[PDB]
Amino acid sequence: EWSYTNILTGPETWHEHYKNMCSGYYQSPIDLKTDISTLDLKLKTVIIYRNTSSTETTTIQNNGHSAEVKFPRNTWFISFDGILDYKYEIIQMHFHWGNTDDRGSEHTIDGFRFPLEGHIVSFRRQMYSSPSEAIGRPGGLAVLGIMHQIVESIKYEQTAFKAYNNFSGVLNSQFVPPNNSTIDDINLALLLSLLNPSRYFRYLGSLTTPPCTENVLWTVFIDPVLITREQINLFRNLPYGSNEKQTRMGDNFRPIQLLNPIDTLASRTLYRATARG
Amino acid sequence: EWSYTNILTGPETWHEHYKNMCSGYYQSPIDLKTDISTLDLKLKTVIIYRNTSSTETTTIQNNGHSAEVKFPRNTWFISFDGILDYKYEIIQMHFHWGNTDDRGSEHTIDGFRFPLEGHIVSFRRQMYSSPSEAIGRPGGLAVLGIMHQIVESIKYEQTAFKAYNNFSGVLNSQFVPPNNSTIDDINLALLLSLLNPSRYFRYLGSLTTPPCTENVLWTVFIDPVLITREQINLFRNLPYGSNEKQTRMGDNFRPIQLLNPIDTLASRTLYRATARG
Ligand SMILES: NS(=O)(=O)c1ccc(NC(=O)Nc2ccc(F)cc2)cc1
Numbered sequence: 001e002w003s004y005t006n007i008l009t010g011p012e013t014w015h016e017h018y019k020n021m022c023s024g025y026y027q028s029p030i031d032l033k034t035d036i037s038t039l040d041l042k043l044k045t046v047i048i049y050r051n052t053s054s055t056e057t058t059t060i061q062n063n064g065h066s067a068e069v070k071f072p073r074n075t076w077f078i079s080f081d082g083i084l085d086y087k088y089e090i091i092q093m094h095f096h097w098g099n100t101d102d103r104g105s106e107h108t109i110d111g112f113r114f115p116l117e118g119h120i121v122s123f124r125r126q127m128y129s130s131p132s133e134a135i136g137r138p139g140g141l142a143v144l145g146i147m148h149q150i151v152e153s154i155k156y157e158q159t160a161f162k163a164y165n166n167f168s169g170v171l172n173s174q175f176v177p178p179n180n181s182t183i184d185d186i187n188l189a190l191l192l193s194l195l196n197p198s199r200y201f202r203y204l205g206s207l208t209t210p211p212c213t214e215n216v217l218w219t220v221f222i223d224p225v226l227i228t229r230e231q232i233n234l235f236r237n238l239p240y241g242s243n244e245k246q247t248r249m250g251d252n253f254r255p256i257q258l259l260n261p262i263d264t265l266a267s268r269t270l271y272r273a274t275a276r277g
Numbered sequence: 278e279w280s281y282t283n284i285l286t287g288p289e290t291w292h293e294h295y296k297n298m299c300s301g302y303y304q305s306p307i308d309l310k311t312d313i314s315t316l317d318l319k320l321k322t323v324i325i326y327r328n329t330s331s332t333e334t335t336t337i338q339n340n341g342h343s344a345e346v347k348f349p350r351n352t353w354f355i356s357f358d359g360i361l362d363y364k365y366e367i368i369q370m371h372f373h374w375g376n377t378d379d380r381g382s383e384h385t386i387d388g389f390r391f392p393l394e395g396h397i398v399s400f401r402r403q404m405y406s407s408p409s410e411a412i413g414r415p416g417g418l419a420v421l422g423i424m425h426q427i428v429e430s431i432k433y434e435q436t437a438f439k440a441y442n443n444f445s446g447v448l449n450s451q452f453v454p455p456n457n458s459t460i461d462d463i464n465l466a467l468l469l470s471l472l473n474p475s476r477y478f479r480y481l482g483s484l485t486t487p488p489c490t491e492n493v494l495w496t497v498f499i500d501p502v503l504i505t506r507e508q509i510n511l512f513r514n515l516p517y518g519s520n521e522k523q524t525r526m527g528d529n530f531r532p533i534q535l536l537n538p539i540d541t542l543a544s545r546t547l548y549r550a551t552a553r554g
Pocket residue numbers: 091092119121131132133135143206207208209
């Protein structure tokens with residue numbers, strides 16, 4: 001069993017309860033340090049694209065730790081190389097947020113926390129035929145991190161919730177774990193257009209929940225998408241699962257890990273991308 | 278379904294036959310370039326050590342593609358950190374060699390091929406309770422590469438074959454795949470004493486046979502251990518398995534892979550270690 005807020009099963013214990021791989025030295029999240037990172041001009045614009053033949057439904061679940069969108073198979077894809085040949089297939093999207101507006105994100109950018117971080121999870125379909133084959137295997141996953149920031153003055157249509165279609169109104173106090181509901185499809189291409197998809201951090205890391213598998217190619221966009229206080233408070237209405245100490249879901253983030261803990265046997269490097277200047 | 282010397286199943290076909298993961302961009306072996314490597318002073322002396330109360334038998338097999346020593350469980354270990362707490366457990370040792378003395382190794386050092394490269398394969402017991410659990414999982418394996426060079430003048434006792442106890446005389450034309458034979462134990466601590474265990478290349482790579490899993494922590498010692506022409510010739514009497522074109526086992530090495538093929542989404546770095554000096 002694991003939690004965020006029960007000190008007995010909480011993040012400080014994962015290294016002992018899930019040594020494979022929460023005890024590793026390629027863990028996530030990390031502080032994304034603009035100064036320390038290596039600018040790699042070969043890293044291209046990220047594209048998110050849909051199969052316009054797909055008609056299957058999208059669902060969202062309160063899994064007791066997060067709000068998790070589950071996408072249908074063969075619907076949403078990532079391209080890192082400009083070809084639309086289905087190398088990365090999107091499986092789900094989940095969120096991490098704070099009890100308060102000054103924290104919530106798992107990654108930090110130069111020490112700064114955002115109120116809400118979204119994780120678009122994909123598998124390397126180029127190599128693995130199914131999500132369940134990729135999830136536990138080397139190099140199986142690529143995750144996109146989308147930072148969200150609160151603004152006071154904005155039209156609904158320019159907020160991230162327009163891409164999310166408000167999650168069909170499911171973010172409320174009655175959305176109890178482990179309830180799942182059908183929702184309107186998420187326009188992930190619109191979501192990505194709300195930020196600069198050429199401007200990102202890139203590194204090799206891990207899942208941020210047990211078992212913290214070190215098979216994630218991370219991409220974290222530097223520019224946030226925009227939301228309102230009203231929208232962040234919808235997430236804060238969700239109840240935590242019964243194994244949490246806190247009642248309302250919030251502070252569902254993992255503490256910062258080092259890029260290179262002292263025990264590492266082969267240092268990793270944090271990379272940075274920016275547009276063909 | 279794979280070979281070294283049959284053009285239908287040979288190394289040029291593995292990226293097609295075993296896309297997961299022989300098509301990847303973290304492949305082994307690589308050219309170990311002294312000038313284009315990063316010195317990491319934190320990388321410590323390698324220690325190999327035995328459980329003195331283990332009594333189980335060692336075997337060697339002609340598996341049709343290499344000579345493979347199979348160690349009993351819970352017997353031989355590697356420490357990278359100076360602690361003897363069974364973080365890495367040795368499973369097996371296999372050999373790669375050439376038809377001729379000018380080639381054989383998988384790795385090169387500044388483009389130089391050695392006549393014989395030994396691979397001491399361990400699983401990360403720190404995280405994974407068994408080899409079968411580790412071999413397919415992220416960060417599962419650590420392999421030591423031992424280069425061997427031929428000298429004309431040496432006492433048997435100062436050759437690598439002293440540490441191998443001459444493979445108990447088992448190596449001949451009759452040692453046919455998939456036969457195994459019980460052998461006297463390999464003194465891997467003696468073997469490591471024959472080179473400088475502080476002086477090595479380090480990088481994240483792959484198995485060098487299918488399915489080329491990208492879960493190997495590589496350590497390749499820069500100084501070779503010494504053998505005679507008679508000793509290399511004992512390997513060359515082994516017969517290849519029937520799916521090979523060549524009759525006698527030789528040239529059982531994979532072609533050199535790039536450190537960073539053009540399609541990489543996160544560059545790896547080659548490290549090197551040297552002594553506190
Ligand atoms: N928070 S995170 O690092 O983005 C993350 C991503 C994915 C998971 N888990 C996941 O996707 N599980 C899964 C299980 C079975 C499947 F078939 C596919 C995915 C956990 C944490």
